[PDB]
Symmetry: D2
Subunit: 295 residues, 4 copies
């Protein structure tokens, strides 16, 4: 036997950081969950009990905190790039660092219509994420995403004209609920290293903003022919608005809301145009995915 | 042996309802999870295989949907009262109905700074809940709550002057993070039946609004001496603002954020006044509770 | 306003303990999650910022570990009694201690048909729990339970003869699947204090064993007329087998498995006697409860 | 823009099947969660609102149930192969089917030391899984796995000799707890189609058994130098015992159990050789991965 692939590190490292403006009194908080996995000339730790090649995961954890103390943790694309660069430069035998960051929301509270200088609310488990792969000799590959963005529209979703054969029982519809949990990823042009990442820092927050805005507006305004068609529209617009993105990926569940026929009870009409009460279905769910790139 | 208590019903009944204004085109959605448990002269179903006394849980489920179709589902206090009243009036041998409703957020989206007529976002897993106990001969007892309201303040929390003995290692502090998940319950005066509940309908939404507003403002503005002291302030104000409430209950975890001493690494200062990076702790957590009533 | 009730402490305290027999080499592990909430003359911590009455939750945590170091952690009924007794005896102003313990399974592995001296497997998330309320002047109240015991029988469950009216659509059946998650609680006679608890120590493990055995055998062997009827049989037998128990509580969801009519596809027969493939339903679910005591 | 990749289908399809031996009365149950995602000439559903190319996900769901009715659902490798083959053969324009199956445990109960003919227990959330990729022109690629296998050993784990630099604070140890959740995958030689899969059917259950046996025995018996070294040993042995496997993948978290220094309290000794009470840590955790193939 032989090692064909190996990576190891520390997962689920929770990190908080606060910024305090001494002058204004305004504090700003950041909270994330970090995973760092390293690759390199480490096979002998697996095959020969050779721990000398192991940068301890506990040290990896320490390094995350130390890096957060000495550097900005925002935008996460930059922080992840700094962190991954550290490992491959510090350790001659480590040749790749894989950094995943989940960013948790702490939105400043508005109290009596005024933003509060140090109090925050978790407005949703929606996450902003990055996957930053720092590979010696191959630059920095960044995938940015938003996830856990849960939405519903009560009309202006349709689904008709699909294939019908002996396995088909679904009725065509010209008016249904559409609800999903949005998982949207935008994949950046390869960066040659940390300098290039730094040169584009403002684009990270701006592109996340765009992705979220486009997602919401398209979902709300598209009289959807299918999840496929709507998600593609979202992806097209994001690519058109940021040339440094190469591809956009969407992964969308169709979280079904079923009509409930109540006509067995006193002739109650609750279907079609009379549909008011529905049964949200926990499972199963459609799952629709696509990766869109430039033509 | 003998049955000392018995209740049975349907749990986890997911319910959606839409309201459509034909004239404006504006649609409004509601989504909840309902549990209904009945009590009554049903012991023989347990002891003698006598299913004639069982209103099937599947029928209970149907009844929830039917009631939602024929009545407003908002405020949940009213809907729960209507539902529970139905069971004890419809079935001579059923003498209590216990209705729990979890209300899920569907906040109307703002697109290009305009509210969208039929698209919604789940802004947080914060829930609005009711527990409505309809008991024949004893009216309607309603407990209203908000839960899953997660907040953090980065300063203006303190904890000193607590008991110190041979089991104590916690250092006193004059400046710490405070983060919690708010579980707040307001218990209404008993109502004699559905008419009385109906007579107060506007107070349900208004009191939920007050409870949430007071919670957020007190959390943000109180330079907290302890979780105990802050939560009490919240409870006092809610009672002062709605005389139909008899008691206010808070259940608050203290979700710890630990300082990280980095001085072992290059003399880095990250404690006390220099504390910027912290380790959020998943467990354990303080848990602080109180029920406040009128003096 | 005034405090009507108050309790506070540390939740989610994870605890592991190992026993090592130096002579045999056999190691035995225990893992639990502990919650301790105290009550007493502590209202001024809520109303007057008086932290002198607060035994810090962090000290409560320390105390849990210290108690685990100096005492057996098994059976959990004893450990909880020792822990709660400590708080009310140590602190004059603390008059009640509420101890909840969740015990996690670490079953010794069998390797090559021989029990291994120090390796364990989590065979299920089934838990063994205790709720131990130590109240000054009122002894020790113990509720013991098993939870998360998930079972299924593929036949020998029936449900017919239930009430049928205009809200009923459920068909009667003489052969259905029954699956549940068992939550079973046995409530002990009040104990006057720690000595009395100690005098009965062997009965705690033996009664848990009995409760589990009776539950499984009755579930497997009862041709069930209803969940109500089956659970009552379980409760009767436990009470008959341990006189120090006063009541038995069961809380059982009916986790539905629906038939799937496939006759629309090539006349496939998959209902009634031909039913082979079913759709497990995540929600809703029946929920059936009862407390059984002595006649 | 253009579609670079696309796949869609039904996720979270829960499936139960029962086998009843009319002659013996012995019933056998199977429960799984199925996901099927299709690829093919479907881009126009995304780009041109062309739903004619969509095999509805609801039809995919129906097909899963129908296939389960007409075929064995065990071993899951075979069932997944049959299912995926169906889609690519039935639909000219569908060229790949990706089938994921999660198998849930229903272990026959032993009542009074005799196996019960129709009652089962979920002994753990350990899963047996398959990923079966049926690609037209490229056969059937199967990855089999076990997951959620949670284990602990209380000694005979070590970790010393790792790299030490200015980021290192972890002390070397010659005796620690090791606990993990095992995720083990064995990747089969490509099969040319369904016939070849069928020709090897007995090897699927036997190799799963081997993987599990080797995992448990190696974990229990290896005086572990590191997670890396132990997992490699597991992978080597599985490859040696089934030549139709090409690679073995392990993904193992190191779920830390920290010592607790209690010497501040009455000089209590609870570290090193005196360590009895530990604090299980929910996060962070080491994460160790490797893929092992043939030299
Ligand atoms: Cl779908
Ligand atoms: Cl606390
Ligand atoms: Cl039921
Ligand atoms: Cl580790
Ligand atoms: Na390097
Ligand atoms: Na009645
Ligand atoms: Na006392
Ligand atoms: Na095809």
């Amino acid at each position: 036997s032989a090692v064909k692939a190996a990576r190891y590190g520390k997962d689920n490292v929770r990190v908080y950081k606060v910024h305090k403006d001494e002058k204004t009194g305004v504090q700003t908080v950041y909270e994330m969950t970090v995973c760092v996995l390293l690759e390199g000339e480490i096979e002998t730790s697996y095959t020969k009990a050779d721990n000398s090649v192991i940068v301890a995961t506990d040290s990896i954890k320490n390094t995350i905190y130390i890096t957060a103390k000495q550097n900005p943790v925002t935008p996460p694309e930059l922080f992840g790039s700094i962190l991954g660069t550290h490992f491959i430069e510090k350790y001659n035998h480590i040749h790749a660092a894989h950094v995943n960051i989940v960013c948790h929301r702490w939105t400043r509270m508005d109290i009596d219509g005024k933003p509060h200088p140090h109090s925050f609310i978790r407005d949703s488990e929606e996450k902003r994420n990055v996957q930053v792969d720092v590979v010696e000799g191959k630059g920095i590959d960044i995938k940015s995403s938003l996830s856990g963005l849960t939405v519903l529209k009560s009309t202006n979703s349709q689904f008709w004209g699909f294939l019908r054969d002996e396995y088909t029982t679904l009725k065509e519809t010209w008016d249904r609920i559409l609800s999903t949990d949005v998982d949207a990823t935008w994949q950046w042009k390869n960066f040659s290293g940390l300098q290039e990442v730094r040169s584009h820092v403002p684009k990270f927050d701006a592109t996340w903003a765009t992705a979220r805005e486009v997602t919401l507006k398209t979902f709300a305004e598209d009289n959807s022919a299918s999840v496929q068609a709507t998600m593609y529209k979202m992806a097209e617009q994001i690519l058109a608005r940021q040339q440094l993105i190469e591809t956009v990926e969407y992964s969308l569940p169709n979280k079904h809301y079923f009509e409930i026929d109540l006509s067995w009870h006193k002739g109650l009409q609750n279907t079609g145009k009379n549909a008011e009460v529905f049964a949200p279905q926990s499972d199963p769910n459609g799952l629709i995915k696509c990766t869109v790139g430039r033509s």
